[PDB]
Each structure stands twice: as structure tokens, then as C-alpha cells.
Amino acid sequence: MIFPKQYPIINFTTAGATVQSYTNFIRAVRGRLTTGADVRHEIPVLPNRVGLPINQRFILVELSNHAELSVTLALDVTNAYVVGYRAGNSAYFFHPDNQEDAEAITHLFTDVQNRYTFAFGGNYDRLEQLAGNLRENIELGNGPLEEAISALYYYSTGGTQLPTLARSFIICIQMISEAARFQYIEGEMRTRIRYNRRSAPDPSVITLENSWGRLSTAIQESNQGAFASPIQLQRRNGSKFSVYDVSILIPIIALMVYRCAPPPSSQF
Ligand SMILES: Nc1nc(O)c2nc(CNc3ccc(C(=O)O)cc3)cnc2n1
């Protein structure tokens, strides 16, 4: 019959999505990821991996679409990573890259008849290669997300083709995980929705997506707030600039992955 623990579900439909409904979506996702506050330098920290019960390890994001089809993604609460998805009576997972993760995964969609684990991992690195295109060439926006939910849904019956599915994962990851991770990327998807525009991310968006782990680390290691090494970012035009300390990042980044036990207190 059973196992334990039902994960929090947050719903969102692309059918007539507005700025208000997407803002609400992204704030409920963050509200469910960070359990109130471990805060370093005025940015909340994500739950620490070691010592976190399986019962609090995942959150579910149910996406429905104008064609009345739904796909539920499963995100890991430690890093907001999309670990797999469920479409009807089938579940698919990216290859776990260590064993506690592999077994954490077995708690996720236990009721489905048909569960599969892909051989490959789910990082942008592999996804782009499978999709046959870079994130710079893939359009983001409500129309793209609508389309992606259908592709994900028909993978199960052979509608398929792995390029298309890999490509639909890139769209989902950026509009949900990255938007939750960065206030700037939530802003970028919000501009696309308020104008019913679809367009690829420019270099400023992509370089923050590649830099998140490193930004999380530099901020938690910083002496007072200054980085022991500057992170190199990009402007919309492609030019690079250095970031020397946390302060300019506070309106840009929304959540950081846990890296270190907090050296001072500050969070109370
Ligand atoms: N499936 C998937 N889902 C994501 O949310 C994601 N995010 C990024 C952005 N960068 C990373 C990379 C690694 C990790 C970590 O190990 O914790 C987190 C974020 C890249 N690929 C990703 N792939």
C-alpha cells in the first residue's frame, strides 16, 4: 500500500497567466523552499542538506496548461533543482549523482505505475547538448512554457524526441528554479509575461545562472561583506564587470544554497 510524506504542492497555469499570478507563484515557491530564515548578509539561505529529514526534502510544482494537461515537477529544497517530473501515470528522474540522493528520489512519486531514471544528469551542460542548442538561443516566456508542458506530457506516449524534452526542461528550470533563485530573473520573466513576449535570455541572465553556487560561496565566506575574490558577471551587452562585495547583489539574488555554518550570528 503506502510510504510516508506528501510534499507541498504549488499550482500555476499558463492559461491567461498575468504578472500578479506569476508573482504569487514565485513567492509561494520561495515561501516553501526557505523555512523562514537562516539569513547571511540579508539574503536567506536554503536548508542544509545534512540533517534534513526526507519529509522536508522536496516540493511539488504543478503546471497546467491551456490544453488542460498537467505535469508536476519535483524540486529539491536544498538547491531548488528540478530532479524529475510526473506526467499522468509516469514519472521520470535525472540520474542522481550520489547515493543518499538516489534513495531520497524513491520517496517522490511512489503511486505512479511506471517510474524511470534517465542515465544522464540534469545540469544545463548535458541538457543543452541533448537539446542541440544553447540557452542563448531558446525562447522563454508563457508561450514557451505552455508548449514545454505539452512536450513533457507527451514524452510518455512517444510524442517525444529527447531534443524537444531536454529543451522543455531548460525553459521550465529558468522560469521556475532560476526565477525563484534570483529576483532579477523573476523580473526578466515578469517583463516577458506583461508584454506577451517570448525571447531568449541575454548574457546577464545566463551568467547569474552559471554563477549561483559561486555567489553563494563568496557571500558566506566574505570577511564582513567583501569577497576574497571578485565574481565576474556580464551586462546585457556581453561586457564583464567584477563584483567586489555583497551589497550590489542584495536586490539581484533571492536565495543561496547553504555552504558554511554561519561564522557570526546576525540571524535571529
Ligand atoms: N535539472 C536542473 N535543475 C536546476 O534547477 C538547474 N539549475 C542550474 C543552475 N545551476 C546549478 C547547478 C548545480 C546545482 C546543484 O548541484 O546544487 C544547482 C544549480 C543548472 N542546472 C539545473 N538543472
Side-chain angles (χ1 to χ4, degrees):
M1 319 66 73
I2 290 302
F3 226 164
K5 201 59 83 298
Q6 323 87 294
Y7 293 112
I9 293 159
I10 293 130
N11 312 280
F12 175 85
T13 176
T14 57
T18 66
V19 167
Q20 176 163 13
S21 60
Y22 179 75
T23 303
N24 277 330
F25 171 50
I26 293 305
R27 278 136 125 269
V29 177
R30 299 206 276 222
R32 291 269 55 151
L33 278 158
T34 350
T35 14
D38 168 15
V39 162
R40 318 293 176 75
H41 306 285
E42 298 171 273
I43 296 152
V45 185
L46 242 30
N48 184 22
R49 183 186 162 59
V50 188
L52 186 71
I54 6 81
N55 6 311
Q56 289 108 262
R57 181 61 192 273
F58 305 109
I59 238 97
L60 259 34
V61 164
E62 189 179 38
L63 273 345
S64 62
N65 190 44
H66 187 291
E68 222 266 324
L69 302 163
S70 34
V71 139
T72 303
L73 280 19
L75 287 51
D76 178 333
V77 137
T78 64
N79 58 356
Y81 188 100
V82 180
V83 296
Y85 84 102
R86 198 258 213 99
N89 219 349
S90 286
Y92 295 82
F93 300 99
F94 290 120
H95 204 267
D97 59 14
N98 57 82
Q99 47 176 280
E100 212 310 305
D101 283 0
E103 79 123 330
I105 261 27
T106 70
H107 296 267
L108 233 19
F109 288 119
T110 46
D111 70 311
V112 307
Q113 289 85 109
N114 317 327
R115 151 184 248 86
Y116 306 76
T117 303
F118 296 112
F120 49 88
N123 53 54
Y124 286 139
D125 335 344
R126 188 69 48 234
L127 250 33
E128 295 186 312
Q129 178 194 221
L130 275 31
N133 233 146
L134 271 22
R135 271 173 282 155
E136 26 275 73
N137 293 133
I138 300 166
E139 307 195 319
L140 298 179
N142 199 65
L145 190 53
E146 219 268 292
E147 284 166 26
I149 291 166
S150 290
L152 282 156
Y153 186 80
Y154 291 109
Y155 184 74
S156 325
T157 57
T160 303
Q161 275 11 283
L162 233 192
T164 303
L165 181 276
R167 188 205 56 71
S168 305
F169 266 118
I170 290 174
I171 302 179
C172 295
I173 288 160
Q174 292 180 92
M175 299 197 57
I176 301 171
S177 304
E178 300 296 15
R181 294 178 178 129
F182 299 95
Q183 284 162 104
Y184 181 73
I185 291 175
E186 180 204 5
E188 286 299 290
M189 299 314 115
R190 189 203 295 132
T191 310
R192 281 167 172 84
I193 300 173
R194 83 188 317 140
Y195 292 136
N196 193 120
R197 163 145 59 166
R198 339 149 69 98
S199 53
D202 54 275
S204 63
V205 178
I206 293 164
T207 318
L208 289 171
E209 295 167 354
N210 301 147
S211 302
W212 191 60
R214 250 255 65 82
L215 284 171
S216 295
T217 307
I219 290 165
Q220 287 166 74
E221 292 178 341
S222 64
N223 175 168
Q224 274 156 330
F227 296 164
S229 208
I231 281 92
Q232 185 185 276
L233 246 40
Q234 287 195 298
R235 304 190 169 98
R236 301 209 186 249
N237 64 354
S239 63
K240 32 71 211 175
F241 59 100
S242 297
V243 176
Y244 290 40
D245 54 272
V246 188
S247 280
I248 187 151
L249 296 182
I250 287 171
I252 300 302
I253 179 148
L255 301 171
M256 299 171 296
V257 53
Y258 188 102
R259 253 76 180 100
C260 304
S265 37
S266 73
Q267 170 50 50
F268 324 90

